[PDB]
RNA sequence: AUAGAGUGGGCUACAGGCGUAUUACAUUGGACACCCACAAGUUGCCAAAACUGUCCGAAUAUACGGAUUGGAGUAAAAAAAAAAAAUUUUUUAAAAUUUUUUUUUUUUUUUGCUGAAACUAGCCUCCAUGAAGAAGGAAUCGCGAGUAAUCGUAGAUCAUUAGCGC
């Protein structure tokens, strides 16, 4: 997971440190 | 951690308060009502509340 | 899912409310409700109490009867519906 | 003035075009322009014992933060010896950080080639030249070849 | 006191070039003197014909019907822009421009236009003795330009307020 | 194929229009109401056609019955974009670069 | 004098050898110098770098069939600091240190005419002279 | 600095480091045994030994799969239902 | 806290993520855009020269 | 009935075996901060690797790695107005405030998300358990400059689901 789960990093794999915008 | 400067957000409406400093402008905008002119009394309606500050 | 609104089971209640003619859980604790209960969807959450209740579940083949018993209490009914792939 | 032609498409695989000149402005200040990546940059050149060299507003040792880098941006400057005398004025867009370094290098070079002729190349006699500075003013327009329309398909 | 700017959209540059060239056409005629005797014109250097570049998008299909995961190819939509740009103090020829591009109609090309101009308030009389200088042009109107049988002549229209 | 048996699914999103169910949706994503939010989606979505929430639309092409690989960029499926596009019979669609 | 700035410029590309930073093999590098310097004065390092790696020149090259090949010498410095390398790794990962220190031992054994470089470095020398 | 414990995780172990002092930069041949006694107090005031909880996860999926229910047999069979190497049981 | 004054003047809320209902009421609605997505002739066209029975009337021999 | 609907499955099952990818097996590294570094990308603003600082190197399976499995869906920060005012905390001599304690206020986030319904079978967040794996034989594939590799990024279809697919 390059750390997916808790990280300063995997954490924009997982498409979260982005964060989401709010949209519909 | 991180987000984009410009929202630019949606599912809701407003009046948009803005301000331009390249010209000195601020800048309202109109949503609510389908017609323009409805719209007009609106915000001419809000600019009046707005000069009760 | 237990924000804004946690429990649905609209058809098992309509079956539910079928059976409460004289008691839902034996208020006449439980004395295993022999009427058959034979639901047609598995999406159902269970809600507390609801015990001692012969519950027929559909597989898409038949309908499966268990009873249910305290453990079960906090489940979707369709976690007890399967398909069958023992081997 | 007569200024002419300099411009090259030195690169493989895709070209490259910086249509701009260098050229003395009437205040004593010379302007150039250089890009070597797509990512661009331009400078502005004052002799003067003044704050010195400046890309992007700030000092340049904070923005350009690695060392290597440094010098990749003054390696023109290092190679010219002409190193202090200049107010360095200069801007920059986009790309990444030693692209910006060896395009803000390739501008401080046309800059320097108008303020010396010879130690640069140029377009002032038919676009030919040389001196020891005149081998870094035709920018290396390289850019990236074109992630591929097709497949890894191994 | 009124300023008009003009967008144009396009897929063919022929297209939206000869639009350009008959609005610029249209402006000069609109504001043109065509006699002496009467002498207040703005060709005032706000005026421009600014070209613009375009939204680079590339949108690539399979080439094949069925399996074929190799077979790709790419496609692509263009947008060709101008803005065409003037402003003038009357209205009867504003009215000339609006009329005449009600009339002269273009071929697979839209017209986004933006008026923002002077208009005069009325004020509830309390404000304004309770006011006893910046910008504050803050109308900014809005308008729909689809699903009820436009193909997109769409004009916008801003508007500037002025109530010292 | 069935792109019309959709559209009879589009029109029961409308017949029944979205508004009542949604209204309904919001009196259940109301946390003001302490209960009955239950009661109130316990029917609502029972007695609303199950048919007409906005899930069991698929969004088929037009041009054909294609019920996968759909475009919106233009309303139309892939292979029939390549024929008009090779055609030329479309807004301005080339062949890239 | 610039093959000083050549042979070190082709050490650090050759130290870069997996996809990253430049600047991480750079500082990587200086390092093994600054550990060179500590080493070699510890129990006088462009000068002992140049000396190994002139020491390891491959003048002739060889080509198997065994047919030698007269060689450009800047690929001989190029062969000559690839074969340095590999022979690092070889020493570091036995050691598994950083490799600043594997790099820096390597150089001054290659200095000292000794290690697997100067081997393998010699071996192919006169066996360039073998087949003629 | 007690990321160290090992009958825990990570976060509850700089936490129950924290609830006794420990900061970080510490080490374990740098604690006084009184605050051993304070942070085994502080483990039966937190919840015990990761062996308990997997004796207490024993029973747990234990009521799972005396539940008659497919994720009792997926745990007499070891399917994913998201490597049946490791069970819990 | 001046934006209060500007927020009481302009009655304004935080729009996304608070669980109170508003956002089901300014969102847009889908309506329109669900409806105009598909476009089917009825196969015989009330002017003249239906080709949807043409193709018929071709295949027939 | 090889025709249409309705409800629920199934199209995703699981000795084996094979293909394609990703992630690692560390120190050229992990973590954490930084300025929140500069992009493709202002036309009708937004990253990561790294650079700089700090912690870590015991066969520890390491603070590497992150598969499986249980469990739970929780904190606040900002500041305004009045009354009073010169109080809280140690040892056997000291300390923090000149703001302590009451009332009214008040924002901005927070809410598990989206959907009618998330057990199978979504996804998110946070705990806990922490597997193999210490670089891979025979065999073999791909590619010689802004290329491999590594690093993000945004577009599609999409209520949400692409982390790895394209």
């Not at chain 5, 008959?22 to 421009?48: H, M, Q, V």
């Not at chain 5, 263009?78 to 591009?101: D, F, G, I, M, W």
Request: net charge positive; hydrophobic share 40%.
């Amino acid at each position: 997971g390059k750390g997916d789960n808790r990280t300063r990093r995997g954490k924009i794999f997982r498409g979260t440190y982005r964060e989401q915008l709010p949209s519909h | 951690a991180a987000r984009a400067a410009a929202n630019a957000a949606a599912y809701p409406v407003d009046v948009e308060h803005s301000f331009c400093r390249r010209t000195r402008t601020a800048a309202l905008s109109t949503a609510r009502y389908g017609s323009r002119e409805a719209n007009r009394k609106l915000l001419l309606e809000h600019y009046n509340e707005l000069l009760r500050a | 899912s237990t924000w804004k609104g946690p429990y649905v089971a609209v058809s098992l209640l309509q079956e539910v409310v079928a059976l409460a003619r004289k008691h839902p859980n034996w208020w006449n604790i439980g004395q295993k409700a022999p009427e058959v209960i034979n639901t047609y969807s598995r999406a159902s959450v269970i809600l507390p109490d609801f015990i001692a209740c012969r519950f027929g579940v559909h597989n898409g083949k038949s309908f499966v009867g268990m009873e249910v018993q305290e453990a079960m209490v906090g489940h979707r009914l369709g976690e007890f519906a399967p398909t069958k792939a023992t081997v | 003035s007569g200024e002419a032609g300099s411009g090259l498409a030195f690169p493989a695989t895709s070209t490259s075009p910086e249509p701009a000149g260098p050229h003395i402005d009437l205040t004593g200040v010379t302007h150039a322009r250089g890009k070597r990546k797509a990512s661009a940059a331009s400078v502005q050149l004052v002799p003067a014992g003044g704050a010195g060299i400046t890309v992007n507003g700030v000092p340049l040792s904070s923005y350009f933060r690695d060392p290597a880098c440094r010098e990749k941006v003054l390696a023109p400057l290092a190679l010219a010896g002409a190193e202090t005398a200049y107010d360095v004025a200069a801007r920059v867009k986009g790309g990444g950080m030693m692209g910006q370094a060896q395009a803000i290098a390739t501008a401080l070079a046309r800059a320097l080639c108008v303020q010396q002729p010879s130690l640069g190349a140029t377009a002032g006699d038919g676009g030919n030249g040389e001196g020891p500075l005149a081998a870094m003013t035709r920018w290396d327009g390289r850019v990236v070849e074109r992630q591929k329309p097709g497949q890894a398909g191994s | 006191a009124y300023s008009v700017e003009i967008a144009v959209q396009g897929f063919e540059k022929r297209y939206v070039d000869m639009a350009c060239n008959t609005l610029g056409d249209i402006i000069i005629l609109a504001f043109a003197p065509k006699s002496y005797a009467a002498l207040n014109l703005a060709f005032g250097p706000e005026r421009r014909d600014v070209r613009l570049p375009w939204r680079r998008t590339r949108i690539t299909l399979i080439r094949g019907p069925h399996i074929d995961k190799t077979g790709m190819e790419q496609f692509e939509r263009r947008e060709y822009k101008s803005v065409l740009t003037a402003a003038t103090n009357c209205p009867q020829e504003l009215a000339r421009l609006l009329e005449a591009v009600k009339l002269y109609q273009f071929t697979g090309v839209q017209i986004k236009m933006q008026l923002a101009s002077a208009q005069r308030v009325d004020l509830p009389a309390d404000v304004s003795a309770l006011l006893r200088x910046x910008x504050x042009x803050x109308x900014x109107x809005x308008x729909x330009x689809x699903x009820x049988x436009x193909x997109x002549x769409x004009x916008x229209x801003x508007x500037x307020x002025x109530x010292x | 194929r069935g792109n019309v048996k959709d559209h009879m699914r589009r029109m029961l999103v409308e017949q029944h229009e979205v508004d009542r169910s949604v209204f309904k949706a919001v009196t259940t994503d109301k946390s003001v109401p302490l209960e009955h939010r239950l009661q109130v989606q316990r029917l609502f979505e029972t007695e609303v056609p199950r048919d007409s929430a906005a899930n069991r639309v698929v969004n088929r092409c037009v041009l054909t019955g294609r019920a996968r690989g759909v475009h919106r960029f233009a309303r139309l499926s892939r292979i029939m974009i390549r024929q008009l596009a090779h055609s030329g019979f479309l807004p301005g669609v080339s062949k890239a670069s | 004098x610039x093959x000083x700035x050549x042979x070190x410029x082709x050490x650090x590309x050759x130290x870069x050898x997996x996809x990253x930073x430049x600047x991480x093999x750079x500082x990587x590098x200086x390092x093994x110098x600054x550990x060179x310097x500590x080493x070699x004065x510890x129990x006088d390092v462009l000068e002992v770098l140049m000396r190994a790696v002139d020491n390891c020149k491959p003048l002739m090259k060889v080509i198997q069939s065994y047919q030698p090949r007269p060689l450009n010498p800047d690929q001989s410095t190029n062969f000559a600091v690839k074969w340095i390398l590999q022979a690092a790794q070889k020493r570091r990962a036995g050691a598994k240190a950083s490799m600043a220190e594997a790099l820096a031992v390597e150089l001054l054994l290659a200095a000292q005419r000794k290690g697997g470089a100067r081997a393998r470095r010699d071996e192919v020398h006169k066996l360039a002279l073998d087949n003629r | 600095a007690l990321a160290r414990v090992f009958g825990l995780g990570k976060s509850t172990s700089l936490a129950v480091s924290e609830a006794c002092g420990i900061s970080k930069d510490l080490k374990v041949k740098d604690v006084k045994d009184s605050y051993i006694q304070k942070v085994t107090a502080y483990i039966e005031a937190n919840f015990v030994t990761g062996d308990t909880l997997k004796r207490q996860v024993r029973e747990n999926v234990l009521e799972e799969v005396a539940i008659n229910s497919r994720r009792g047999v997926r745990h007499t069979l070891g399917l994913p239902v998201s490597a049946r190497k490791l069970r819990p049981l | 806290v001046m934006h209060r004054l500007r927020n009481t003047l302009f009655g304004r809320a935080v729009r996304p993520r608070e669980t109170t209902g508003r956002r089901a009421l300014a969102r847009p609605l889908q309506g329109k855009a669900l409806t105009d997505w598909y476009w089917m002739p009825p196969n015989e066209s009330p002017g003249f020269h239906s080709e949807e029975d043409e193709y018929e009337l071709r295949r027939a021999l």
